[PDB]
Design a protein around this ligand. Structure first.
Ligand SMILES: CC(C)CCCCCCC[C@@H](C)CCC[C@@H](C)CCO[C@H](CO)COCC[C@@H](C)CCC[C@H](C)CCC[C@@H](C)CCCC(C)C
Ligand SMILES: CC(C)CCCCCCC[C@@H](C)CCC[C@@H](C)CCO[C@H](CO)COCC[C@@H](C)CCC[C@H](C)CCC[C@@H](C)CCCC(C)C
Ligand SMILES: CC(C)CCCCCCC[C@@H](C)CCC[C@@H](C)CCO[C@H](CO)COCC[C@@H](C)CCC[C@H](C)CCC[C@@H](C)CCCC(C)C
Ligand SMILES: CC(C)CCCCCCC[C@@H](C)CCC[C@@H](C)CCO[C@H](CO)COCC[C@@H](C)CCC[C@H](C)CCC[C@@H](C)CCCC(C)C
Ligand SMILES: CC(C)CCCCCCC[C@@H](C)CCC[C@@H](C)CCO[C@H](CO)COCC[C@@H](C)CCC[C@H](C)CCC[C@@H](C)CCCC(C)C
Ligand SMILES: CC(C)CCCCCCC[C@@H](C)CCC[C@@H](C)CCO[C@H](CO)COCC[C@@H](C)CCC[C@H](C)CCC[C@@H](C)CCCC(C)C
Ligand SMILES: CC(C)CCCCCCC[C@@H](C)CCC[C@@H](C)CCO[C@H](CO)COCC[C@@H](C)CCC[C@H](C)CCC[C@@H](C)CCCC(C)C
Ligand SMILES: CC(C)CCCCCCC[C@@H](C)CCC[C@@H](C)CCO[C@H](CO)COCC[C@@H](C)CCC[C@H](C)CCC[C@@H](C)CCCC(C)C
Ligand SMILES: CC(C)CCCCCCC[C@@H](C)CCC[C@@H](C)CCO[C@H](CO)COCC[C@@H](C)CCC[C@H](C)CCC[C@@H](C)CCCC(C)C
Ligand SMILES: CC(C)CCCCCCC[C@@H](C)CCC[C@@H](C)CCO[C@H](CO)COCC[C@@H](C)CCC[C@H](C)CCC[C@@H](C)CCCC(C)C
Ligand SMILES: CC(C)CCCCCCC[C@@H](C)CCC[C@@H](C)CCO[C@H](CO)COCC[C@@H](C)CCC[C@H](C)CCC[C@@H](C)CCCC(C)C
Ligand SMILES: CC(C)CCCCCCC[C@@H](C)CCC[C@@H](C)CCO[C@H](CO)COCC[C@@H](C)CCC[C@H](C)CCC[C@@H](C)CCCC(C)C
Ligand SMILES: *C/C=C(C)/C=C/C=C(C)/C=C/C1=C(C)CCCC1(C)C
Ligand SMILES: *C/C=C(C)/C=C/C=C(C)/C=C/C1=C(C)CCCC1(C)C
Ligand SMILES: *C/C=C(C)/C=C/C=C(C)/C=C/C1=C(C)CCCC1(C)C
Lengths: 222, 222, 222
C-alpha cells in the first residue's frame, strides 16, 4: 500500500506465521505433559502476533490520535498483542523455574499494568501526559526485570536454559520503552516506518527466537 | 421494536434466562467439589449469554459497519458473549476427560483466536478482507475440533458423556462459520432476521441443551 | 482543573499510590509461598486502582453519554478498574478459607457479570434501560454476598480474619449500587463531585483498608 512501513508489517506477518506453523509441527509428537505446556504457550505467542501483525498490515489495527498539533498514526493493535503474549512469555519463564503462584500472579499483573498503561499512553491526546503513562509502564517493566533476577536448586537442564532466556528477555524487552519514546508515540524523533522495523525485529526475536531457544532445549521435559 | 429480528433476540433472552435459573436451582444441593465445578461453568454460560442477548434486544450490542456499499448492522455483542462462553464450554469438556493443562491452554487460546479474529472480521470495512479473517477463524475452529478428537482409560461414566457432548459440539459449532458466511456479516445471502434465528437456535442448543445433557449425567461427580 | 471533583480524584490517586508502595515494601521480606500469594493479590489491587484514578484525574477515563436530555459525564475507567480488582479481592477471601475451585469460578464469574453489566448500564443511551442493567448487576452482587455467607473447620487464625474481611466486604460493596443509583449514572439526585467523593472513600477503604487488615494478620501464613 501507501504506507511505507507496509513492508515491515508484511514481513512480520510472514515470520510470525511461519514461526507458528514451525512450532505447531514440532510439537506434533509430544506427549510429555510438561513439554506440552511449553509447546502450547510457545506456539500461541506468535499465532496471536500473526493475527495482530496482519491486522496492522490490512489497516484494521491503526487509528489516528491528535496531539502536539498533528494527527498521529498509532498502531493500537500492538497492545492487543502484547496484552496476551507478554504474560505468556513470562509464564514460560515461570514454569521453567517452578515459580510460586504468588510470584506468577505478581508477574502477570505487573505485565498487565505495563501494557495497559502503555495503551493509555498511546491513545492520550495531551502530549505531556503521554510520557507520564510511559514512565508508569517503564516502572512495571523494571519490577518485572527485578523479579526475574531477584524473585527466584533447579536441575541444571533448567538453570542454563532459564538463564539464557532470561538474558534475552531483559535485553530485548528493555528496548521497547526506548523505541516508543523516540518513535511516533512519543517524541517523534525516529519516523514510523523505522519504528515499525525496530518493533518487527524485536518482536520476531522475542517470540520466535525465544521460542526456538526454549523448544530446542531438554529443559522443557519432565 | 422496528427490527424484525427482535423476536428472536427476545426469545433468546428468555431461554437463556430460564436455563440459567434452572441450572442455578439444580446445583443448589451440590457439595461434591468436582460436580460444583461443572455446575459453576455450566450455569455461567447461559447467564453471560442472557446478558448479551438482552443487550442486543435493547440495541446496545448493535453497531453499523459500512462495507460493500451499505451501512451494515452488526451485532458485536455476540463476540463479547462467545469470548467467554466458548472457552467455558471447552473447559467442561476438558475437565470431563481430565485433560493436561497444556491441552487446556491450547484449547482456550485457539478459542480466543477464533472469536477475536471473528470479531475483527465482523468490524472490518474492506469487504474482501472480512473473509480473510473468517478463514483464519475457521482454521482455529478446525484446530479445536482436531484436538477434541485426536488430542486426548476414562471411567465409562465419563467416556459416554464426553462422546455425546463432543458430538454435539462439533456439529453445532461447525454451523456458526456457515451462518456467518452467508449472513449479514459475510455474503449477505440470508437476511439478518433469519440469521438471528439461526444463531438463536444454535446458541440455545450449544449452551442450554449441552448443559442439560452434561448436568443430568453422573459423569460430573467424583 | 475545571472539574470540581478533581480534588477527590487527586486524593484517590495519591492514597492508592501510597497504599501500593506501602504493601510493596511490607511484602519485601516474605518467603512463605502462601503469604506471597496474599501479598501479590493485595498489592496489585491498589496499583491497578492507582492507574485508573490517574486516568480519571487526567481526563482519559471520562466520556460523555447522552441520555434523559443531557450530555452526561461518565467515568468509565472505574469499570476497567473493578473488572480486575473486584475478582482479586474475592480471591483473597477465597484463598483464606481454602475455597473449592468451583466456588471460586462462581465468584469470579458472577463478579464479571456484575461489573460488565454495570458498564453497559453506565454507557446505555436509553434512560429507563440503564436501570434494568443496574438491577441485573445488583442481582449478581447479591449472589456473591450469598455465597460469601452460605457458600462455605478453618484454623481460627483464618476464621477470625475471614469474618472481619467478609463483614467489611458486604457493608462497603453494598453501598456502590446505592451511590450509582442516586448519582450521575442513575437518577441524578447527588451531584458528580459528591459521588466521586463517595466512590473515593469506598474504594480506598475496600482496597487499602481491607488490605491493611488482611496483611497485618497471621492468617495469611501457612
Ligand atoms: C489486570 C491484571 C491488569 C490491568 C491493568 C490496568 C490497566 C488499565 C488500562 C486499560 C484501559 C483500557 C483502555 C481502553 C479501554 C480505552 C479505549 O479508548 C480509546 C482511546 O480513547 C479509543 O480510541 C482508540 C481505540 C483503541 C482501541 C484499543 C483496543 C485494545 C485491544 C486490546 C483488548 C483486546 C481484548 C480481546 C478482545 C477479543
Ligand atoms: C514520583 C512519585 C509521584 C510524583 C508525583 C508528584 C508530581 C506533582 O505534580 C504537580 C506538579 O505541578 C501537579 O500535577 C497536577 C497537574 C497534572 C498532574 C500530572 C502529575 C501527576 C499525574 C503525577 C501523578 C503520579 C505520576 C506517576 C509517576 C510514575 C511512577 C509510578 C514511576
Ligand atoms: C537490542 C538492543 C537495542 C541492543 C542491546 C543488546 C546488548 C545485549 C548485551 C548482552 C546482555 C545479556 C547478558 C549476557 C549473557 C550473560 C549473562 O548470564 C549471567 C550469568 O547467569 C546472568 O546474570 C545477569 C545477566 C546480565 C544481563 C544484562 C542484560 C543487558 C542489560 C539490558 C540492556 C538492554 C539494551 C537496551 C537497548 C537500547 C535500544 C536501549
Ligand atoms: C521520573 C518521574 C518521577 C516520573 C514522571 C516522568 C514523566 C515525564 C514527563 C515528561 C514531560 C516533562 C514532557 C515535557 C515536554 C517537553 C520536552 C517540552 C514541553 O513543551 C514543548 C514545547 O511546547 C512541547 O513540544 C513538543 C516537543 C516534543 C518532541 C518533546 C518530547 C518530550 C520528551 C519527553 C521525555 C520524557 C523522558 C525523557 C523521561 C526520562 C526518564
Ligand atoms: C488470547 C489468549 C486470545 C487473543 C486472540 C487475539 C485476537 C485479537 C483480536 C482482538 C482485537 C480486539 C478488537 C477491538 C479491540 C477493536 C475495536 O474496534 C472496533 C472496530 O474498528 C470499533 O467499532 C465497533 C465497536 C465494537 C466493540 C467490540 C467490543 C468487544 C466486546 C468484547 C470484550 C468485552 C471484555 C469484557 C468487558 C467487560
Ligand atoms: C495459505 C498460507 C498464506 C497464504 C497467503 C499468500 C497470499 C499472498 O497475497 C498476495 C496475492 O496478491 C497479495 O496480498 C497482499 C494484498 C493484501 C494482503 C491480503 C492477503 C494476505 C492478508 C494473506 C496473509 C495470510 C492470509 C491468512 C490465511 C488464513 C490461514 C491461517 C488459514
Ligand atoms: C446443525 C446443522 C445445521 C445440521 C447438522 C446436524 C447433523 C448431525 C450429524 C450427526 C453427527 C454427530 C455424530 C453422531 C453421534 C455418533 C458419534 O459417536 C462416535 C463414537 O465415539 C464418535 O466418533 C466420531 C463422531 C463423528 C461426529 C460427526 C459430526 C458431524 C460432522 C459435523 C457436520 C456439522 C454440520 C454443518 C452444519 C451445516 C449448516 C453446514
Ligand atoms: C483458503 C485460503 C488459503 C485462505 C484465504 C481465504 C480468503 C477468502 C478471500 C475471499 C475473497 C476472494 C472474496 C472475493 C469477493 C468476490 C466474491 C467478488 C469480488 O468482487 C465483487 C464484485 O465487485 C464484490 O462484490 C460483492 C459480492 C459478495 C456477495 C461476494 C461475497 C464473497 C464470498 C466470499 C467467499 C469466501 C469463502 C467461499 C471461502 C471458501 C473456503
Ligand atoms: C466473564 C467471566 C464475565 C463477562 C460478563 C459479561 C458482561 C458483558 C458486558 C461487557 C460488554 C463490554 C462493553 C463494551 C465492549 C462496549 C463499548 O461501547 C461503549 C458504549 O457504547 C463505547 O462508548 C464509550 C467507551 C467506553 C469504553 C469502556 C472500556 C472498558 C475498559 C475495561 C476493559 C479493559 C480491558 C484491559 C485493556 C488493557
Ligand atoms: C423478573 C424476571 C424477568 C422479568 C421480565 C418481564 C418484563 C416484561 O417486559 C414487558 C413489559 O411491557 C415488555 O418489555 C419489552 C420492552 C423492552 C424490554 C425491557 C424489559 C426486558 C428487558 C426484561 C428482560 C429481563 C429483565 C432483567 C431483570 C433483572 C433480573 C435478572 C434481576
Ligand atoms: C458504608 C455505608 C454507607 C454505611 C454502612 C455501615 C454500617 C456497617 C454495619 C456493620 C455490619 C458489619 C457486621 C458487623 C461485624 C459483626 C459481624 O460478625 C458476624 C459473626 O461471624 C458475621 O455474621 C454476619 C455479619 C453481618 C454483616 C452485616 C453487614 C451489614 C449489612 C450491609 C449494609 C450495607 C450498608 C448500605 C450502605 C448504604 C449507603 C445503603
Ligand atoms: C425488580 C425487577 C424485577 C427488576 C427490573 C427493575 C428495572 C427498573 C426499571 C426502572 C424504570 C421503571 C425507570 C422508570 C423511570 C421513572 C422514574 C420515570 C419514567 O419517565 C420519567 C418522566 O419522563 C423519566 O424522567 C427522569 C427522572 C429520573 C430522575 C428518574 C430516575 C429513575 C429511578 C429508577 C429507580 C430504579 C430503582 C428504584 C429500582 C428499585 C429496586
Ligand atoms: C512479543 C512482544 C514483546 C516481548 C513486547 C514487550 C513490550 C514491552 C516490554 C513494552 C514496554 C513498554 C514500556 C515499558 C513503556 C511504554 C510503552 C511500552 C508498552 C512499549
Ligand atoms: C455459545 C456459543 C457458541 C458455542 C458459539 C460458537 C461460535 C463459533 C464456533 C464461531 C465461529 C466462527 C468462525 C469459525 C468463523 C468466523 C465467525 C465465527 C466467530 C462465527
Ligand atoms: C475496589 C472497588 C470495589 C470493591 C468496587 C465494588 C463495586 C461494586 C460492588 C459495584 C456494584 C454495582 C452494582 C451492584 C450495580 C450497578 C453498578 C455497580 C457496578 C456500581
Amino acid at each position: 500500500t501507501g504506507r511505507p512501513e507496509w513492508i515491515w508489517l508484511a514481513l512480520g506477518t510472514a515470520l510470525m506465521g511461519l514461526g507458528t506453523l514451525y512450532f505447531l509441527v514440532k510439537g506434533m509428537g509430544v506427549s510429555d505433559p510438561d513439554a506440552k505446556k511449553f509447546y502450547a504457550i510457545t506456539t500461541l505467542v506468535p499465532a496471536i502476533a500473526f493475527t495482530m501483525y496482519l491486522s496492522m498490515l490490512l489497516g484494521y489495527g491503526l487509528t489516528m490520535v491528535p496531539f502536539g498539533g498533528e494527527q498521529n498514526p498509532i498502531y493500537w493493535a500492538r497492545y492487543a498483542d502484547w496484552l496476551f503474549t507478554t504474560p505468556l512469555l513470562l509464564l514460560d519463564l515461570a514454569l521453567l523455574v517452578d515459580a510460586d503462584q504468588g510470584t506468577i500472579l505478581a508477574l502477570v499483573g505487573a505485565d498487565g499494568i505495563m501494557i495497559g498503561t502503555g495503551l493509555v499512553g498511546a491513545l492520550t491526546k495531551v502530549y505531556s501526559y503521554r510520557f507520564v503513562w510511559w514512565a508508569i509502564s517503564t516502572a512495571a517493566m523494571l519490577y518485572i526485570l527485578y523479579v526475574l533476577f531477584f524473585g527466584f536448586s533447579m536441575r541444571p537442564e533448567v538453570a542454563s536454559t532459564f538463564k539464557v532466556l532470561r538474558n534475552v528477555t531483559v535485553v530485548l524487552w528493555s528496548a521497547y520503552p526506548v523505541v516508543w519514546l523516540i518513535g511516533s508515540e512519543g517524541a517523534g524523533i525516529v519516523p514510523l516506518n523505522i519504528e515499525t522495523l525496530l518493533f518487527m525485529v524485536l518482536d520476531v526475536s522475542a517470540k520466535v527466537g525465544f521460542g526456538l531457544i526454549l523448544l530446542r532445549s531438554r529443559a522443557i521435559f519432565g
